[PDB]
Structures are given as structure tokens and as C-alpha cells.
Structure 1
């Protein structure tokens, strides 16, 4: 007897597509290009890794299933699985050192590597673990993930901070020019204080998994790894070695200039006038007067774009310059229809909030004019 199970296409494709996603294309060592299939009892367990992240998905098997474990090329399996007609039943078994995929009038033969070639995750015990709604953890990542740095160096900037303090879980992300942070409360005890820095590629992956809009995920924070367990999936990620800076000392303190405006009209006007801004720096000029915002941009060809937007503003007069992409990025994640800007002077950072709550906060440094 050998490994043999039977599964609907849609039953298999849902986790296989996710698991295959973390599997890098054409790795040095061949096993790292494969998904690990394990049948134990009536359950199928697909595991993929890139030596930084390990994703595991599980499917119940409705029919009989003789058990076993083997690894098979992830992409080819997924490509095959998706190319099959809707609702058809797939037969998967091992013969010799090959995987035999039959479904309808189609027969596929993939080349396998042994289950013991697959690396095991050397994960120890948690230092703190809790549960939180998938929607809440997804909100923390998505409301701030845009502000992470984009280089690959193993430095705190190229990752998101997850911080547990009081009864609240907080995400923080910054690239040195802008910062995004979001904070919600959860069923964590209050004597708890602990930080982890999840790398950029990993935390963006974790957000992609938190799709059950009404589900719950179990988080475990350790010295070197972080575990997300959703009953359908088990996501594991190495951490960033190093301490995250005192992000609190980056939030601006003395803003006497409140600007309330329409989120969309600002995004559209910033984006519009940027067409004639400088391609490298993408700087625009904000010119605040009483109840008015005058936007200006110009480029080396001495082309120029102005646009006036009516806004709520009863403060002083201020002229300030910003990298328009930083502004559009913040406006991209603002959920409310109105947006609040808190400025001080032309050379100090801007603070952006949503209209009706301060759970998420965004700091954007300006440009010298």
C-alpha cells in the first residue's frame, strides 16, 4: 500500500494555490521547489517553504484515503490542478518515485522527492500567544503595510513591528520618510509587553491569508518566529533580528494647523497636479490660506500645474512641500470620507488621521522648498 487519496478540484485548489505561492521558482536545491503532501487519517496537509516562511494548508478528505507522505513540484501540481474542469474529482497516488494525478480523461505523472528531504521548522515555544479576529489583524497590517521600506537588507526598516501593550495590539511601519501605525485592542492580558519585527515579504503574505472576514486566528510570538494558525492554515515566519526604534519620538507634537478635507477630492487633485511635477522627486507645493488649499507642481521644462481645493481651515498661513506619492499612499488607506491633516511649520512632519477616529495615525515628512 502507498499514499492514495481522492479530492475535488475546488477542494484542493484553494489551499494548494496559497501554499504554492510561498514556494520560490527554480530554487537551487530541488526539494525547495516542491510542496509536501501528507495524508494522515482523513486529512491532507500541504506545506511550502522558502526557508524564511512556511505555509501549511489542510483539507478534509471526504472519501477513503490510504496514507503517506511525499513531495511534488508545487507549481506544476497547481498549474495542473487549475487546468482541470470545474467540480471534477482528482485521483492522486504514488507509484514508484512518481506522483500519479488522474482526473477524467487526463493523466499526469510528476517526479517526486522524499518527504524527508523537506526541511522542518526549528520552532521552539511561545513567549506570548493569543487569539484575534482575522479582520482585526488584517486591518493592522493593511492600514500600515505601505510604509515599510523596500530594500532587502536585514534591518528593522524592511519589516513591520507588531507590539503587544496593555490590552492592545499595534502595528508600526516606517521607511524613514513616512510612518504608519494602527492600534486595536484584543483579548491579551495587560501585564504583557513584547515586540516582534515581521519581515516585509512575510507580513504581506500573512495579510493575504486572513481572508475569512468573520474568522479567528491564533497568534504565537517567539524569540525568532511568529505563528498564525487559522484551522485551515498555519503560517510561520522568521523574525527580523534587532530592536525597533522608539517610534513614539517620531510623532509630531505641536500642530496648530488643522486641515479637514474630502479624501477623494484631495487624492484626485494631488494626483492631477503631479503630472507636471518632477519625475524623480515628485514634489508638490501646498499653499494654505483661509479655507483654501492651493496645490502647485512644476518640472525642469518650466511646465506648471496649479489646482485650488476648497477645504476646512481656519488657521494661519502656511506653505509646505511634499512628495506627492507619500500623500497619495496615505490617502489610499484612509477609510473615512473626510481626512484630517495636522501641520505645524514648513519643515516639520505632517500628521494625518481619519475623520472620526485616531486608531490609525500617519506621519509624513515634508520637502524643503
Structure 2
């Protein structure tokens, strides 16, 4: 038996945190459930998709301790729709979970707690406190470049690791999908120096980042070669990592591109977006005809449509033509923090570096395509 009462707001806060992990499509019914575990003065909540597990805790008045599983999204929506201030009773005498508040009564089917997946966290490092805003930045500056593919390939997560440069150790995140790269870094907090490099799955980053919005001043990170764990206070997210070595991305990031050009980032981005409008295609390529003082942008669609726009830029080198996917270019322009962007080109077939003058702790790479 389990039997308790909990304030709607506390119940809603916890269910809200954990239910995000549950895939709407699930042909294994137990993976649609939350594990509820009541003991002492706390109701604990766990949900999983097998690759990761979110846990949270709320205060509750516990008459009889116990554990049961119940449908996650349905439980969340019931509680959401209960009146403000409602005190919520959870109990069992059918074999269903009884949720009772004011004049509403719900009976949900349950599944036994013993069939609920167990996520082991053996051999994690000690907790590493990382400033929340700094961590949010590592993710927001890079996340867009992680592939959206449905595999467990190394490109489908964010490579988190430390490196030694500029007379200190940095905590770095690198994302690449084979078409583009993003890199962001920060001075390594105490305890992060020399963590093993881990590839954190895309969905895990998305969930961590969501939980970061409601976190405090810091989030604790723990890492092992098999597992990564984020603690946000009462909530925690534990995840598998992608197995295998991440590519030697330091060879992909060009160091010696000598054709340097600076431009007004907002004007350029608007010009790119404008010329790209000619095409409705999923991928749209834009030609950059670069010459002293100017970039001429051209997009063509699959039905003889054409758009051209000239943008003045700061450049004095040899003229050349280079092509990029317009979405990848706009993604980079979207991350630039100030009004200028700096591009470093070599030849039309080589990777292009984009640097942000107001932030030396990011690097973006664009891969050219045929123009």
C-alpha cells in the first residue's frame, strides 16, 4: 500500500520535471509510467526512456510508504487541471492508483515497481559545480550543430571535455554533424580538470538544458566513461553516453586560413535570408562571390528562380567564389554575440572559420559546397 497527501503545486512541479523524458510513442507500456516512491517526508518521481533517467523529489505528508508506477502524461494533465491550492491524495481499494482532490476522483492503472528499469550510477566522479549560466552558454552556442539522426553514432551528441590552452585548462563542448562544427569553451571549474571526454546524447542535452531553466546558481556534473549525471538540486538527470572516440576535430578546425573578411553580421544575415527566400527546398545553397569590398550573394531554386544581393564587406584579398548551405550559414550568424563577424577562408574547397570578435571562446566551421 502507498498512501499520502501532497500540495498540487509541489506535485505539479515534480511531475513537470520528470515527464519530459517520456516518449509519446511507447509500445512498452511501463516506459510511459512514472515510478512513485513515498518514504518519510518525500515523494520521489522517476521517469526514463532507457537512455536517460530523470528523478525529482517533492515534500509530502506520507501515511503509508510504498512504491508504484502510473501513467506519466495522464498523471501530469490531471494534476495540471485540478483547482489552484488543491491538496492531492494519492492512495489505494481497487488495484488502481486513486487520485483524489476536492470533488474529483481518478483511478489509473498501475504497473509493478519491480519491472521499472534501473539506471546504475556506479563509478561516477565526484560532483563538479559548474555555474548555471556558463553551462547554458556551452550548450546554446553549440547544440544546433549536433546531428538529428536516429542512430548511436558519435555525431549524435555533444563532446564535453577539457583541454589545456592559453595558460589554463578549459571545459569545452564540440558539436558536429559532418556538415558544420560548433565549439564553445569556458575556464575549467575546480574538479573538471582532466575529466574523461564524454559524448552526451542530443536528447540528454535537450533535457538537461530544459532543467537548467529552473535550476539554481550552479549545476553539479558527474562523469564516468559509461555515464553522465546532472544534479539541479532536487532534480537529477542520469544518462548513458555515446560509445566510441569522438573524431580528432582539431584537424577539422582550420588554423591558417589567411583570407580574412569582416562584415556587419545583422545586415549580412538579413541579406542571406532574403536571397534564400527564392527557394522553398529543404536545403538551399547560397553562392558567395567575394571580391575587394563586396560579397554578391546568389540563390537559385529548382524552377529557374534567382535572387541576387550585394553586401559591402571589409576585405582586400584575391576574389573567389564559395558556396554554403544557407541554413548552416544563418545558424552561425544567429550565434554571433556582437555586430561584426569575422570569416577566415582558404580556398573554395576548404573549411571556413567564423570567429566572433566579442567572444574568443567560440569557433564555428562551415564546410563549402560546390558553386
Scaled by the length of structure 1, the TM-score of the pair is 0.93
Cα pair 1:348 1:365 within 8 Å, conserved: yes
1:248-281 Cα shifts (integer Å, max 9, x gaps)? 0001122223222233222221111012248254
Q: Displacement of 1:57 after TM fit? A: 1.0
SS at match of 2:88: strand
Deviates more, 1:47-56 or 1:97-106: 97-106
112, 119, 123: which one pairs with 2:121? Answer: 123
Q: Displaced runs of 4+ in structure 1, greater than 4 A? A: none
Quick one: distance in 1 between partners of 2:302 and 2:172?
42
Where in structure 2 are the equivalents of 1:150-229 lying within 5 Å? 150-166=148-164, 167-189=169-191, 192-212=194-214, 214-229=216-231
Q: Which of residues 109, 112, 118 in structure 2 aligns to 1:111?
A: 109
Alignment partner of 2:138: what SS?
helix
3-state SS of 1:194 partner: coil
- Are 1:14 and 2:16 counterparts? no
> How has the CA–CA distance of structure 1 residues 201 and 253 changed in structure 2, closer, same or farther, with 3 Å as cutoff?
same
1:276 is paired with a residue whose SS is: coil
Question: Structure 1: which 5+ residue stretches go unaligned?
Answer: none
CA distance in 1, matches of 2:91, 2:284: 56
Distance 1:321 1:29, change over 3 A: closer
2:157 and 2:175 in contact (8 A); partners too: yes
The 2-side partners of 1:214 and 1:191 are apart by 23
Call closer, same or farther: CA 1:189–1:48 in 2, change over 3 Å: closer
Query: Is 1:138 equivalent to 2:136 in the alignment?
Result: yes
Over aligned residue pairs, what C-alpha RMSD do you find?
Answer: 2.0
Asked if residue 32 in structure 1 is aligned to residue 34 in structure 2, the reply is no
CA distance in 1, matches of 2:347, 2:126: 42
For 2:180 and 2:65, locate their aligned partners in 1 and report how far apart those are by CA, in whole Å: 52
Matched with 2:90 is 92
Q: What CA distance in whole angstroms lies between the structure 1 residues aligned with 2:195 and 2:108?
A: 49
Query: What residue in structure 1 maps to residue 365 of structure 2?
Result: 363
TM-score under structure 2 length normalisation = 0.92
Deviation at 1:366, TM superposition (A): 0.8
Cα distance in 2 between the residues matched to 1:215 and 1:231? 10
Secondary structure at 1:113's aligned position in 2?
coil
Instruction: Give the C-alpha shift of residue 68 in structure 1.
Output: 1.8
Q: Distance in 1 between matches of 2:20 and 2:30?
A: 15
d(CA) in 1 for partners of 2:296, 2:264: 15
Instruction: Verify the 8 A CA contact 1:267 1:328 in the aligned structure 2.
Output: yes
Once residues 211 and 192 of structure 2 are traced to their aligned partners in structure 1, the CA distance between those partners, rounded to angstroms, is 28
Moved more, 207-216 or 65-74: 207-216
CA contact under 8 A between 1:349 and 1:363: conserved in structure 2?
A: yes
Between the aligned partners of 1:192 and 1:292, the Cα distance in structure 2 is 45
Match of 1:293 in 2: 295
How many residues align? The count is: 367
Quote the Cα distance in structure 1 between the aligned partners of 2:149 and 2:43: 37
Distance 2:214 2:314 in 1: 39
